[PDB]
Structure formats: C-alpha cells, structure tokens
Amino acid sequence: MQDYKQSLKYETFSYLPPMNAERIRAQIKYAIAQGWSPGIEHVEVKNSMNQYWYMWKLPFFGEQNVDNVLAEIEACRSAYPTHQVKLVAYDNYAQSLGLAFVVYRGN
C-alpha cells in the first residue's frame, strides 16, 4: 500500500503531468476549433481561489492563430513572473468557460 501525498491542485489537468508545449498547443487548438475565444488570467498564488483573477488585456475574441495566444501567455508571464497564469476559453453561446487550465503554477 502506498500513501497518498497531499498537495495543492490547479483544477482541470492538474492531476496529469505538467504540460509541455505540444500539449498546451493542442488544448488551445481545441478551444479555437470549438469557436471559443482564448483568454489569459493571472493572479497571486495566495489568491488562486478568488472568483476574479486579473484578466490579461481582453479575451482574444475571434483569434484563430494559436501562436498569438502562446505569445500573449509569454507576455503575461514576463509582466507577472510570480503569478499563476491560467488559459481560459470563453464560450459565448453558453456564457461559460468551455475550457480552463493553469499553464504556469506561479511562485
């Protein structure tokens, strides 16, 4: 029998191994193909459970290029290198997030 080690988690996909560039890219491709608008949120690690993280600029409404989203993830990282950074995908038909996952767990 193995003992389960308790650690903080980061919602969807945080129980998988941390994503490389290809796995992140594939999720953004999925969100765009669903017609969702990618967006970037960031927050201080201690505030990760708030409903309202900082929004990075505006959601990239009608963005079709995955590389633009990746560049803005990098831009947000540089602006707030200690913040947790989350990739969200807005679904205007459901007025929900079709997808959301943390790309950088912060420090």
């Binding site: 389960y4 308790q6 129980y15 998988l16 594939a26 999720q27 999925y30 459970m49 997030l97």
Partner: protein, 455 residues
Amino acid sequence: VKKYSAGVKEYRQTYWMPEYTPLDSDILACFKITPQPGVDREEAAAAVAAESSTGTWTTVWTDLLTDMDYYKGRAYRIEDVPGDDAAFYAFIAYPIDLFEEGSVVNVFTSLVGNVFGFKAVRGLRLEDVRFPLAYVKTCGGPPHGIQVERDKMNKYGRPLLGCTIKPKLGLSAKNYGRAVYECLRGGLDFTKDDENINSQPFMRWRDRFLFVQDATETAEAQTGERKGHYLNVTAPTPEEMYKRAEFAKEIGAPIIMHDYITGGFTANTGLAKWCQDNGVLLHIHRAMHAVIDRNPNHGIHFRVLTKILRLSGGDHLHTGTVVGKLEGDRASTLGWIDLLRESFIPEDRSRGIFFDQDWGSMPGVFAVASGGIHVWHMPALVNIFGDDSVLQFGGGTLGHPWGNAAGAAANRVALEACVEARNQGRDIEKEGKEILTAAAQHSPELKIAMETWKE
C-alpha cells in the same frame, strides 16, 4: 350537446376530433393504447381523452354548465406502433387551462395518475408529453442549472467527479466525515449521502452535516479546489426537510440532495424554490427502470419523468447507469441527455421523441452517471455524457486497494486523461485502454485501480 340526457354514452362523438389541429398552448400527449377487444381505436382514444379530462363514465347534467368544446381533451390522431399490432398511438391535446400553473405533476396525474379506461382500454402507456412554452414559463425549473453551477463552483472544461459514501448504511457521523474527507482531498469534486441516508440511529442528520462540512472545508483548503458534498435533506415532513436544508445553508454547504422518489413532487418543488432563494445547488435522485419506468408496455416512460424533474427543479439528475446498457439504448441515452440539457429538442421517433419540446431559457440539468462504474468505464462515460455531467464513482473510489484518497486520484487521473485525449481529437472510446495505460504510467494509483477491476 345542448340538452341533458342521462345514461352511458360513447365518447367518440365528443372526444375524437381527427380534424383538430393542436394549438401552440396545448399540452400534447402520446399514449400507446391497447383497446379492449371489439372496441374501435377511435373510441378507445376518445375514452382516454375523456377520462383524462372532462369525461364521466355516464352523462352528467353539469357538463351543460360549461363549454366542453373548449375544455375537453380531444384525441386528434392515431398511428400504428412499429412492431406491435394490438397497440396504437393516440395523440391527445389538452387545453392549457386544465392545469394548475407551475404544477407539472397536476398535468401528469391528470394524464395517467387516475385514468383507468372507461371500459374501452385494456392497456395504457404515456410515451411523450409536449409541455408548451407557455406552461414551461410557469414552472420554477432548475434553481441554477449547468452554467450557473459551473460559475458557482468554478469548474470548467470537464465532467465533475462524485462519489457516494459506502457502505450505504452503518457509518457513524465522524467516520462518514472521514470517508468524505479522504475522497475529497484525493481529487473528487463532490461526495454525497446515499439516497437512504437521512437521519438514522447510527448517524443523526445534524451530526453528519457538521462532520461532513468540516471534512469539506478541510479538503478544500488542502487541494485549493472547491469541494462539495450532497447533504441529503430528504425528510418525513416538509418542516423537517426545510430545517435540514436551512442547517446546510447555515454551515456553508454549497449543495444538497433530495430523493424525489422518497420525498415526492410537492416536497421537491418546494425545495427547488427554496434552493434558488438561498443559492444552494440541488441534486435530484429519481431511480428509473425501477417500479415506474422499466416495463416497456406498462407505465410512464423515463423521458416524461425526465421532463417533469427538469420543470420541478434540480441542478443534477440521477437515475441509473448508462454504460452497462446496450448500444441499442445508447441512442435513448443520448436523447435522455438532450432533454436534460438542451433548450430545444426536435421531434425524432427513432429516439422516442414524438413532439418538439421547447424549453426556451429554462436552464439545463447536469446528467449524472453512477452504478458499478470504475476507471475502465471512463472513456465511454466521457464520450457519452460529455463535459456537462457528473460521474459518480462510489465503490470505484472507496473500493480502491489503497483507500479513498488514492481511489479519488485514480478516477481523477483517468477522467483528465480521457478529457485531454478527447480535446486532442482522439477517439477515446476506441483508444480507451491505450489512453488509460499511458496515463497509468505516471499515476500508480490509476495503475493498480486498472488492476483491481477488469477492462
């Protein structure tokens, strides 16, 4: 008829209107009727329209005090059943005025509750009911629905994971909270009372609520993810039901559950209104293929009951398992899901849908999958239910060889691996084993879970 003549009469001349076009406001019903031998189809359909509306087994003089032509239910079309020959389909329209606003069972029990036959029908079965939008707008519906529930719990991009605490009965409150704590800290979004956990001698409800809530807060702090436990407020009386719900709200419990079978429509509808007034999520359990919805030629079909439960109100709805069901009824599983979640369901005989059902803006309901499901079921479950569902793994979590936390983690890893693979475009049902096997390379909990139960 303008004049009173006492005596038994046929119903065909009043209650069979083959030239009637249903109004948009009409409640429409599709009955599978097997008539008594010798009785014509048009007469038997007329008999069901009479008994479920303004008809009496003998002529009464009080009919002449009102206008029957406006108020009566009237059968307007008859269709053969594809397969049977004894039975036929009767389509009967009911003026919306026949029913109490916001009381959808008053529709239901009028239709089949007390409809014995008027000596013309030997077999009745309610297949579908078209609730017009005008009537839908009068019902409370789900207190929150899928989108608001995801916003309240901050959960996006995957099905939610749940687990009923086992054994179903026998655990003390503190031991119950221990099981809950271990499941929640391991990666489940929710735990839940068993449907028949109310307030028993071995575990009084108030003690359970307190220990469970302490377990929920602890695991939430230790995971950084929102957690919940469906506290069962099903109670012998409405006062007791409300009292337990109030205590759930008082201690900060985000979600409660109600056994619709135990409690009944009146309690459930009141509870759903209370939940919207108090911002508490409401999980509904109503077993189908059990007493009511299992017999294929006798009873009320589960899609009618599904429509009722959505109107009565619930944020989650659970009946039985879907994966163990055959590929044939999977099409009926997919149609069941759509009635729960979609805004407009078009008619489709192949799925058993005889009318367009318009929900308008009424929120959708989370579909819940349970049963004896474990990690190996995860690919099929993700593929069938999609994201707007709750996958409950009771035995699949507490039956893990390393305990609840490891079991919760195994299911959480399996779920996320399937969701990620689906988002990558892979056919997760065909590639299920490979997806789980690969994810099992990084999750020892998942690895031994796959060895505990069979593919």
